[PDB]
Design an enzyme around this catalytic site. Sequence first.
Site, PDB file in Angstrom:
ATOM      1  N   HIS A 192       8.214   5.314 -10.655  1.00 35.41           N
ATOM      2  CA  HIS A 192       7.709   5.821  -9.419  1.00 35.41           C
ATOM      3  C   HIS A 192       6.530   6.741  -9.750  1.00 35.41           C
ATOM      4  CE1 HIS A 192       7.597   7.135  -5.219  1.00 35.41           C
ATOM      5  NE2 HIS A 192       7.529   8.377  -5.613  1.00 35.41           N
ATOM      6  N   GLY A 193       5.325   6.454  -9.248  1.00 36.16           N
ATOM      7  CA  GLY A 193       4.176   7.346  -9.418  1.00 36.16           C
ATOM      8  C   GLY A 193       3.920   8.145  -8.191  1.00 36.16           C
ATOM      9  N   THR A 194       3.755   9.474  -8.450  1.00 32.94           N
ATOM     10  CA  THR A 194       3.539  10.418  -7.309  1.00 32.94           C
ATOM     11  C   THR A 194       2.764  11.649  -7.752  1.00 32.94           C
ATOM     12  OG1 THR A 194       4.640  11.339  -5.346  1.00 32.94           O
ATOM     13  CG2 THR A 194       5.706  11.538  -7.507  1.00 32.94           C
ATOM     14  N   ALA A 215      14.591  11.147   1.842  1.00 35.32           N
ATOM     15  CA  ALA A 215      13.641  10.614   2.749  1.00 35.32           C
ATOM     16  C   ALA A 215      12.951  11.798   3.422  1.00 35.32           C
ATOM     17  CB  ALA A 215      14.374   9.787   3.791  1.00 35.32           C
ATOM     18  N   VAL A 233      15.927  12.792  -4.683  1.00 33.83           N
ATOM     19  CA  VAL A 233      15.197  11.871  -3.858  1.00 33.83           C
ATOM     20  C   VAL A 233      15.728  11.978  -2.407  1.00 33.83           C
ATOM     21  CG1 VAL A 233      14.691   9.407  -3.586  1.00 33.83           C
ATOM     22  CG2 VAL A 233      14.831  10.360  -5.798  1.00 33.83           C
ATOM     23  N   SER A 252      11.234  11.345   6.444  1.00 32.54           N
ATOM     24  CA  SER A 252      10.921  10.949   7.841  1.00 32.54           C
ATOM     25  C   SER A 252       9.483  10.515   8.000  1.00 32.54           C
ATOM     26  CB  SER A 252      11.215  12.076   8.828  1.00 32.54           C
ATOM     27  OG  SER A 252      12.615  12.426   8.601  1.00 32.54           O
ATOM     28  N   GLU A 289       6.669  -5.162  -6.532  1.00 34.21           N
ATOM     29  CA  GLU A 289       7.142  -3.854  -6.138  1.00 34.21           C
ATOM     30  C   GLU A 289       8.597  -3.970  -5.822  1.00 34.21           C
ATOM     31  OE1 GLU A 289       4.573  -2.699  -2.839  1.00 34.21           O
ATOM     32  OE2 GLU A 289       5.369  -4.206  -1.424  1.00 34.21           O
TER      33      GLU A 289
HETATM   34  C1  LIG Z   1      -1.082   6.525  -1.498  1.00 33.64           C
HETATM   35  N1  LIG Z   1       0.296   6.898  -1.912  1.00 33.64           N
HETATM   36  C2  LIG Z   1       0.278   7.938  -2.981  1.00 33.64           C
HETATM   37  C3  LIG Z   1       1.198   7.224  -0.742  1.00 33.64           C
HETATM   38  C4  LIG Z   1       1.839   5.980  -0.090  1.00 33.64           C
HETATM   39  O1  LIG Z   1       1.215   5.617   0.913  1.00 33.64           O
HETATM   40  N2  LIG Z   1       2.928   5.207  -0.489  1.00 33.64           N
HETATM   41  C5  LIG Z   1       3.488   5.180  -1.726  1.00 33.64           C
HETATM   42  C6  LIG Z   1       3.674   6.378  -2.446  1.00 33.64           C
HETATM   43  C7  LIG Z   1       4.088   6.399  -3.779  1.00 33.64           C
HETATM   44  C8  LIG Z   1       4.328   5.187  -4.460  1.00 33.64           C
HETATM   45  N3  LIG Z   1       4.631   5.252  -5.778  1.00 33.64           N
HETATM   46  C9  LIG Z   1       4.978   4.138  -6.412  1.00 33.64           C
HETATM   47  O2  LIG Z   1       5.241   4.151  -7.600  1.00 33.64           O
HETATM   48  C10 LIG Z   1       4.731   2.790  -5.852  1.00 33.64           C
HETATM   49  C11 LIG Z   1       5.010   1.654  -6.686  1.00 33.64           C
HETATM   50  C12 LIG Z   1       4.899   0.399  -6.145  1.00 33.64           C
HETATM   51  C13 LIG Z   1       4.457   0.247  -4.824  1.00 33.64           C
HETATM   52  C14 LIG Z   1       4.139   1.347  -4.014  1.00 33.64           C
HETATM   53  C15 LIG Z   1       4.291   2.646  -4.529  1.00 33.64           C
HETATM   54  C16 LIG Z   1       4.086   3.888  -3.750  1.00 33.64           C
HETATM   55  C17 LIG Z   1       3.670   3.915  -2.371  1.00 33.64           C
END
Ligand SMILES: CN(C)CC(=O)Nc1ccc2[nH]c(=O)c3ccccc3c2c1
Length: 213
Positions: free
Chosen positions: A46-48, A63, A61, A65, A159
């Site tokens: 998971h990338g964030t 939700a 983890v 909303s 995904e």
């Molecule tokens: C632009 N994003 C940082 C925010 C978002 O709109 N959604 C989101 C936000 C974080 C996400 N991080 C994931 O690792 C990922 C991996 C495969 C497919 C989608 C995601 C993913 C999707």
Amino acid sequence: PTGAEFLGDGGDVSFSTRGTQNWTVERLLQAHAQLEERGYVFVGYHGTALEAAQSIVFGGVRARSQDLDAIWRGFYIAGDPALAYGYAQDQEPDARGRIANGALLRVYVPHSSLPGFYRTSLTLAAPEAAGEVERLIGHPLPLRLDAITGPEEEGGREETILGWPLAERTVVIPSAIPTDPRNVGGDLDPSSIPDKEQAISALPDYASQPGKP
Ligand SMILES: CN(C)CC(=O)Nc1ccc2[nH]c(=O)c3ccccc3c2c1
């Protein structure tokens, strides 16, 4: 039960643009073994953003909303860190037009939840996919105690979307794959992936068994 409980020995871990502090691949190996001992199984990356990473690891983890009603809502992860890497950044820029690099996380689920993970052969953007997925999971979207894996678009990497209830049962720890403050918006360098992490990153059989169509 949060990822904070599974960090192993060593100092305090924190997320920074210059890397996860006090986290190494060697420490990850210990943490991984602890998670496996307790019945968890690795399902993807998971990338964030940094602050989100900290919240996920130390608070769990949950939700938030966001995008309620959207049939594809859930916790998005990927077996291939390269797909997750793209999302590892701040969303909104700084006061001075700086968007910081984020962090890559490893997501683990209780082994007994694996029967709720499904794979489709269809691309998730195909207009037929929602209905095909609802047939796999046995209920209308959104996902609940279940997950779907498929390509994001044709040719795309796959995904995995965990339904928020299922995502609440995950534990998340840091990856030892670094993000690069110079490569925001960019692609993961394959050579920055530690071999020893690769060796503990096989996914369960739902991810390689033919998708259902
Ligand atoms: C632009 N994003 C940082 C925010 C978002 O709109 N959604 C989101 C936000 C974080 C996400 N991080 C994931 O690792 C990922 C991996 C495969 C497919 C989608 C995601 C993913 C999707």
